[PDB]
Design an enzyme around this catalytic site. Structure first.
Site, PDB file in Angstrom:
ATOM      1  N   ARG A  49       0.744  -1.094   0.202  1.00  0.00           N
ATOM      2  CA  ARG A  49      -0.145  -0.014  -0.022  1.00  0.00           C
ATOM      3  C   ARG A  49       0.809   1.292   0.182  1.00  0.00           C
ATOM      4  O   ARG A  49       0.485   2.386  -0.492  1.00  0.00           O
ATOM      5  CB  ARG A  49      -0.906  -0.139   1.297  1.00  0.00           C
ATOM      6  CG  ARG A  49      -1.218   1.414   1.752  1.00  0.00           C
ATOM      7  CD  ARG A  49      -2.704   1.846   0.844  1.00  0.00           C
ATOM      8  NE  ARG A  49      -3.395   2.872   1.654  1.00  0.00           N
ATOM      9  CZ  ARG A  49      -4.260   2.673   2.736  1.00  0.00           C
ATOM     10  NH1 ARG A  49      -4.373   1.170   3.007  1.00  0.00           N
ATOM     11  NH2 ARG A  49      -4.722   3.471   3.288  1.00  0.00           N
TER      12      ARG A  49
ATOM     13  N   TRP B 172      -3.944  -8.372   3.966  1.00  0.00           N
ATOM     14  CA  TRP B 172      -5.616  -8.050   4.607  1.00  0.00           C
ATOM     15  C   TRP B 172      -5.631  -6.659   4.903  1.00  0.00           C
ATOM     16  O   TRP B 172      -4.376  -5.861   5.141  1.00  0.00           O
ATOM     17  CB  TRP B 172      -5.754  -8.832   5.784  1.00  0.00           C
ATOM     18  CG  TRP B 172      -4.923  -8.631   7.144  1.00  0.00           C
ATOM     19  CD1 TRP B 172      -3.338  -8.586   7.171  1.00  0.00           C
ATOM     20  CD2 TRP B 172      -5.348  -8.082   8.125  1.00  0.00           C
ATOM     21  NE1 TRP B 172      -2.972  -8.267   8.630  1.00  0.00           N
ATOM     22  CE2 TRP B 172      -4.406  -8.172   9.196  1.00  0.00           C
ATOM     23  CE3 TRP B 172      -6.573  -8.115   8.992  1.00  0.00           C
ATOM     24  CZ2 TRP B 172      -4.459  -7.610  10.538  1.00  0.00           C
ATOM     25  CZ3 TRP B 172      -6.845  -7.587  10.138  1.00  0.00           C
ATOM     26  CH2 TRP B 172      -5.498  -7.427  11.106  1.00  0.00           C
TER      27      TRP B 172
ATOM     28  N   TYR C 158     -12.186 -14.774   6.164  1.00  0.00           N
ATOM     29  CA  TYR C 158     -11.573 -15.946   5.482  1.00  0.00           C
ATOM     30  C   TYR C 158     -12.708 -16.550   4.704  1.00  0.00           C
ATOM     31  O   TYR C 158     -12.307 -17.306   3.664  1.00  0.00           O
ATOM     32  CB  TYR C 158     -11.026 -16.920   6.592  1.00  0.00           C
ATOM     33  CG  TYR C 158      -9.865 -16.275   7.332  1.00  0.00           C
ATOM     34  CD1 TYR C 158      -9.118 -15.154   7.274  1.00  0.00           C
ATOM     35  CD2 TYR C 158      -9.327 -17.056   8.471  1.00  0.00           C
ATOM     36  CE1 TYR C 158      -7.775 -14.688   7.739  1.00  0.00           C
ATOM     37  CE2 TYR C 158      -8.155 -16.645   9.062  1.00  0.00           C
ATOM     38  CZ  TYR C 158      -7.663 -15.429   8.817  1.00  0.00           C
ATOM     39  OH  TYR C 158      -6.441 -15.166   9.636  1.00  0.00           O
TER      40      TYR C 158
ATOM     41  N   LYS D 267      -7.490 -18.558  12.591  1.00  0.00           N
ATOM     42  CA  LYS D 267      -8.790 -17.828  12.995  1.00  0.00           C
ATOM     43  C   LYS D 267      -9.989 -18.796  12.422  1.00  0.00           C
ATOM     44  O   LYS D 267     -11.174 -18.874  12.944  1.00  0.00           O
ATOM     45  CB  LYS D 267      -8.967 -16.578  12.644  1.00  0.00           C
ATOM     46  CG  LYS D 267      -8.385 -15.590  13.735  1.00  0.00           C
ATOM     47  CD  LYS D 267      -8.910 -14.218  13.245  1.00  0.00           C
ATOM     48  CE  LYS D 267      -8.434 -13.529  12.299  1.00  0.00           C
ATOM     49  NZ  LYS D 267      -8.587 -12.099  11.796  1.00  0.00           N
TER      50      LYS D 267
HETATM   51  N1  LIG Z   1       0.877 -13.671  12.862  1.00  0.00           N
HETATM   52  C1  LIG Z   1       0.411 -13.369  11.515  1.00  0.00           C
HETATM   53  O1  LIG Z   1       0.700 -12.278  11.261  1.00  0.00           O
HETATM   54  C2  LIG Z   1      -0.473 -14.307  10.868  1.00  0.00           C
HETATM   55  C3  LIG Z   1      -0.787 -15.658  11.235  1.00  0.00           C
HETATM   56  C4  LIG Z   1      -1.779 -16.377  10.773  1.00  0.00           C
HETATM   57  C5  LIG Z   1      -2.494 -15.900   9.608  1.00  0.00           C
HETATM   58  N2  LIG Z   1      -2.306 -14.711   9.421  1.00  0.00           N
HETATM   59  C6  LIG Z   1      -3.189 -14.293   8.325  1.00  0.00           C
HETATM   60  O2  LIG Z   1      -2.299 -13.931   7.086  1.00  0.00           O
HETATM   61  C7  LIG Z   1      -3.126 -13.049   6.055  1.00  0.00           C
HETATM   62  C8  LIG Z   1      -1.918 -11.953   5.715  1.00  0.00           C
HETATM   63  O3  LIG Z   1      -1.642 -11.214   6.707  1.00  0.00           O
HETATM   64  P1  LIG Z   1      -0.038 -10.842   7.327  1.00  0.00           P
HETATM   65  O4  LIG Z   1      -0.150 -10.918   8.678  1.00  0.00           O
HETATM   66  O5  LIG Z   1       0.865 -11.639   6.523  1.00  0.00           O
HETATM   67  O6  LIG Z   1      -0.069  -9.542   6.886  1.00  0.00           O
HETATM   68  P2  LIG Z   1       1.098  -8.137   7.518  1.00  0.00           P
HETATM   69  O7  LIG Z   1      -0.014  -7.308   8.275  1.00  0.00           O
HETATM   70  O8  LIG Z   1       2.241  -8.637   7.771  1.00  0.00           O
HETATM   71  O9  LIG Z   1       0.936  -7.520   6.099  1.00  0.00           O
HETATM   72  C9  LIG Z   1      -0.199  -6.788   5.275  1.00  0.00           C
HETATM   73  C10 LIG Z   1       0.255  -6.552   3.971  1.00  0.00           C
HETATM   74  O10 LIG Z   1      -0.866  -6.167   3.194  1.00  0.00           O
HETATM   75  C11 LIG Z   1      -0.435  -4.898   2.689  1.00  0.00           C
HETATM   76  N3  LIG Z   1      -1.688  -4.189   2.416  1.00  0.00           N
HETATM   77  C12 LIG Z   1      -2.623  -3.963   3.544  1.00  0.00           C
HETATM   78  N4  LIG Z   1      -3.612  -3.161   2.835  1.00  0.00           N
HETATM   79  C13 LIG Z   1      -3.642  -2.858   1.650  1.00  0.00           C
HETATM   80  C14 LIG Z   1      -4.030  -2.235   0.463  1.00  0.00           C
HETATM   81  N5  LIG Z   1      -5.068  -1.361   0.719  1.00  0.00           N
HETATM   82  N6  LIG Z   1      -3.399  -2.125  -0.657  1.00  0.00           N
HETATM   83  C15 LIG Z   1      -2.474  -2.962  -0.939  1.00  0.00           C
HETATM   84  N7  LIG Z   1      -1.591  -3.502   0.108  1.00  0.00           N
HETATM   85  C16 LIG Z   1      -2.271  -3.503   1.393  1.00  0.00           C
HETATM   86  C17 LIG Z   1       0.435  -4.121   3.307  1.00  0.00           C
HETATM   87  O11 LIG Z   1       0.935  -3.228   2.737  1.00  0.00           O
HETATM   88  C18 LIG Z   1       1.415  -5.210   3.759  1.00  0.00           C
HETATM   89  O12 LIG Z   1       1.988  -5.643   2.774  1.00  0.00           O
HETATM   90  C19 LIG Z   1      -4.114 -12.605   7.252  1.00  0.00           C
HETATM   91  O13 LIG Z   1      -5.473 -13.071   6.604  1.00  0.00           O
HETATM   92  C20 LIG Z   1      -3.811 -12.634   8.540  1.00  0.00           C
HETATM   93  O14 LIG Z   1      -5.015 -12.712   9.455  1.00  0.00           O
HETATM   94  C21 LIG Z   1      -1.224 -13.632   9.833  1.00  0.00           C
END
Ligand SMILES: NC(=O)c1ccc[n+]([C@@H]2O[C@H](COP(=O)([O-])OP(=O)(O)OC[C@H]3O[C@@H](n4cnc5c(N)ncnc54)[C@H](O)[C@@H]3O)[C@@H](O)[C@H]2O)c1
Ligand SMILES: NC(=O)c1ccc[n+]([C@@H]2O[C@H](COP(=O)([O-])OP(=O)(O)OC[C@H]3O[C@@H](n4cnc5c(N)ncnc54)[C@H](O)[C@@H]3O)[C@@H](O)[C@H]2O)c1
EC number: 1.3.1.122
Lengths: 360, 360
Positions: free
Chosen positions: B41, B84, B148, B121
């Site tokens: 973003r 997300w 999800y 989740k």
């Molecule tokens: N511990 C964890 O972080 C974890 C564990 C299990 C599952 N997840 C899941 O993984 C999935 C991805 O999450 P994450 O933790 O990897 O993400 P994060 O919070 O590390 O990264 C978010 C990424 O999404 C991008 N983004 C957000 N809004 C945007 C927009 N409007 N336009 C473009 N890019 C955008 C951000 O720029 C960033 O690159 C989610 O569903 C989350 O719930 C995460």
């Protein structure tokens, strides 16, 4: 008779011994082709008389008998000590293991390795103040009279002065098929299910709340055998203490449901507020019922107290926090695993296959 | 520019996105050699400007912007949706994922696969009545508004009618290094440790008794990346929902001690009878302290609320019973794992390596 490796399996009727006798004979097994000498206390039972193992009945607590029977075995390359006396006595367990080594080390000029099987009691204590888990192999000994300590000390001593390699395997609760084991949880629960079904009673869980709900782990007997073989042949694994489990965790609550399904009977789960009762006590008078089940289903003849260890089930059903780590073995390159729910069922299937427990 | 595969990494500054950007460029990575388009973003941050990824700043919730920026990318073969919106809103999360697919599916004539990352989740509910564990991939959806569910439905719909393969990855708690994540537990705890050390205070555990003592699991970000790549290239893994964790379990109590050691400060563990307090509240006024730490240590400039997610730490420290199973992936042949205590330390080392947090 040309063989690459010659195993002495001490405790060949046991829960792990009996899998070794099968696993060592597979065509792709590391170290193969294997010759197998199988030692146990009783005359060869009928369910082993049809396997390609040279069966030696020997009371290995008798030093002179062990010498006379094992001294002539000049060709042994690998010892697999998968036995115990059936009590926690440090002296009588130690005598067994010393007599094995004292009989074979001077006579087997090509001996390479000794595998010693102990267990996760090393981490929490004896059945007669635990470490916290997940248990790792480097955790120091507890200050308790654990015969595992004596067995290790004997192993280290004897292999060190004779330039032999060693391994110490510490399996979790074993899922296996031998009806002559002194601690076979799957057979124990199958016998209880079988008796319930015979008496038109539900499969009622007798254990604690905590053990119904907590995470638990186990090891398939064939996976222990694979792991022991691996350590016995792979130079990277040499001279290491190693845990052995299926790689995952389960809960008894899930197992219980599967068990009732497998025996086509109704399940009664843990009932909030209801305290553990003793399965050993519930089964105290069932010898004749067992005998009758045996005869009708033309099962391999077994006596109740041999095939089942109700007391060992009572312990499992008041235990928690006993998870052990497989990171050491995985970091050494052993990636053997089993799906524990599937391994549990595999043991049920096998015991029916071999006619130890009733079909269907 | 000749490449075997062309990845679109949606969320390239994220906790998993940022590992993909590294893992996709390794010489032995399946599917390679890879070209990498990385979407996020914000303008490309300084700590990414020196990686070989074609960085595209795009607000992917804006349909017209996403079209203008991604429609020209004709060469994409594999989409990795690792993003997300930073809330639980079903509609605004779904809009992001639909705009990705609507922009790329009609324009990338060699598109093969879409990887969708969700999480555990799915099994227990939303942060705003859980299944019991160990969680397995076949467990049905809960009756809750979990974004999800929408993301999966969109994935199944769109890949089905366009003859694309799909995977759904459900990682456990992620151990990673990105300072721009909205949920990075390791950075969050490193920031808290760093602030404690700066203020000459002990590393005091703020969480629940249950979370101090219970078994927990996590996944290394590089292992998630390996797993996603594997599912994206290995035909045996196609069209499967798949959990992803390190293969083992740990306890926060053990992690806490390691954390205090790594920051050379005293630890205060869980204190019997003491109730959870909020780490978000304890840290509410620390923005300037963070800024000062940044400047003195000439760290990569980060703002407190970006690098740390104290609220996410508060959740972890009141959770239990969330273990997930890797049996499905292992039975499909994926035997990737990590030692979680070692992965946790690896993340600390890396964040110091990259100058996000202070050395020593
Ligand atoms: N511990 C964890 O972080 C974890 C564990 C299990 C599952 N997840 C899941 O993984 C999935 C991805 O999450 P994450 O933790 O990897 O993400 P994060 O919070 O590390 O990264 C978010 C990424 O999404 C991008 N983004 C957000 N809004 C945007 C927009 N409007 N336009 C473009 N890019 C955008 C951000 O720029 C960033 O690159 C989610 O569903 C989350 O719930 C995460
Ligand atoms: N669930 C389990 O059974 C389990 C789990 C973890 C660790 N362990 C450990 O594994 C080790 C081996 O136990 P097991 O459960 O495999 O054994 P078991 O009870 O299945 O087998 C005992 C074997 O030892 C033999 N034996 C006993 N006394 C003998 C004697 N005097 N002479 C000759 N042979 C004799 C028996 O004939 C039998 O073959 C023990 O230290 C045990 O505590 C067992």
């Amino acid at each position: 008779k040309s063989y690459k490796s010659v195993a002495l399996v001490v405790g060949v009727t046991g829960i792990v011994g009996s899998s070794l006798a099968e696993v060592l004979k597979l065509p792709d097994t590391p170290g193969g082709p294997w010759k197998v000498y199988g030692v146990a206390r009783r005359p060869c039972p009928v369910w082993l008389a049809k396997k390609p193992v040279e069966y030696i009945q020997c009371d290995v607590s008798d030093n002179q008998e062990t010498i006379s029977k094992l001294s002539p075995l000049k060709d042994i390359t690998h010892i697999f000590y998968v036995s115990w006396i059936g009590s926690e006595d440090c002296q009588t367990n130690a005598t067994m293991f010393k007599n094995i080594l004292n009989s074979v080390i001077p006579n087997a000029s090509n001996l390479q390795h000794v595998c010693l099987q102990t267990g996760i009691k090393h981490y929490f204590g004896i059945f007669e103040v635990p470490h916290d888990s997940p248990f790792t192999e480097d955790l120091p000994r507890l200050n308790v009279p654990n015969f595992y300590h004596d067995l290790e000390d004997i192993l280290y001593e004897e292999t060190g002065k004779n330039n032999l390699t060693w391994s110490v395997h510490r399996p979790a609760l074993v899922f296996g098929f031998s009806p002559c084991s002194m601690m076979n949880i799957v057979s124990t629960l199958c016998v209880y299910a079988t008796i319930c079904k015979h008496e038109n009673k539900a499969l009622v869980y007798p254990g604690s709340k905590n053990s119904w709900n907590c995470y638990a782990d186990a090891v398939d007997a064939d996976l222990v055998a694979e792991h022991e073989i691996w350590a016995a042949v792979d130079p990277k694994a040499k001279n290491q203490v190693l845990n052995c489990n299926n790689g995952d965790v389960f809960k008894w609550k899930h197992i219980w449901k599967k068990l009732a399904e497998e025996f086509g009977i109704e399940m009664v789960g843990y009932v909030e507020g209801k305290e553990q009762v003793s399965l050993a006590e519930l089964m105290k008078d069932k010898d004749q019922v067992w005998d009758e089940i045996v005869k009708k289903n033309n099962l391999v003849p077994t006596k109740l107290k041999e095939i089942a260890a109700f007391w060992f089930a009572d312990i499992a059903f008041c235990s928690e926090n006993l998870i052990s780590s497989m990171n050491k073995s995985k970091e050494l390159g052993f990636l053997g695993f089993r799906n524990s729910m599937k391994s549990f069922v595999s043991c049920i299937d096998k015991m029916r296959d071999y006619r130890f427990i009733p079909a269907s």
